[PDB]
Ligand binder design. Structure first.
Ligand SMILES: [Fe+3]
Ligand SMILES: [Fe+3]
Lengths: 143, 143
């Protein structure tokens, strides 16, 4: 019973979560090249976490009677100017993902799609946590 | 001690294994849309299997002192004309992946990169198995 509009929006987001996963893997390639096994391992966990986010969107879309369409994934950046600069790029990206979700939340509220509104709440909470995990990294590394 | 040429070839293949994973997920979107939960679940296992193939290339490249660079992933097809037509596309794709590996095997033999030659042998064996798993599906579904 999902509108085509809310379905398109959730499919767009599914593809956004796939690119999120690819960017984070890209960041690991930078960390691994620079010898930072530990930051690379962190980025690889994150890349796997975003994939399960994308599959939660995948399965919810089919539960509501929609179809998934996978789009082209753009080439991510492969180099930053140091650790801090990578993680600040991570944080900026997370915040873009959070705004992306909030616009779906708004459209769901508009259409009174109470099931979608409830589905997204988990992703709102998890992005709050992830944004703050990156802030704690940046603070721990300060100066 | 890997040549730039053998490194580029293994990085190209890493990106080929990522697209392999995306094509297989695409095939699942087709199966799931058509109600075939079972063929979709098969394609999702396969997509996850190719990802670990791509990460074996990822970690081997760094073990030999190279860097990974992630490229853009093209949009896969999202529709086939039935089950059999999907799996025949799967088989044709596997065979392209096998030829891709054999050309790396050849370049490794040329450069007497005995470590790469041994690394790829696992992927030669696994593609033989996967190609035959798809043939057994096609035969079981015949007419
Ligand atoms: Fe996410
Ligand atoms: Fe593979």
């Amino acid at each position: 019973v999902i509108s085509e509009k809310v379905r398109k929006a959730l499919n767009d987001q599914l593809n956004r979560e796939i690119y999120s996963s690819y960017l984070y893997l890209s960041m690991a390639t930078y960390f691994d090249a620079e010898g930072f096994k530990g930051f690379a391992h962190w980025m690889k966990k994150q890349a796997q976490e975003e994939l399960t986010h994308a599959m939660k969107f995948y399965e919810y879309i089919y539960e509501r009677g929609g179809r998934v369409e996978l789009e082209a994934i753009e080439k991510p950046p492969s180099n930053w100017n140091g650790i801090k600069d990578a993680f600040e790029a991570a944080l900026k990206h997370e915040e873009f993902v959070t705004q992306s979700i909030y616009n779906i939340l708004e459209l769901a509220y508009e259409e009174k799609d109470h099931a979608t509104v409830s589905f997204l709440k988990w992703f709102v909470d998890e992005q709050v946590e992830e944004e703050d995990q990156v802030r704690e990294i940046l603070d721990l590394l300060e100066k």
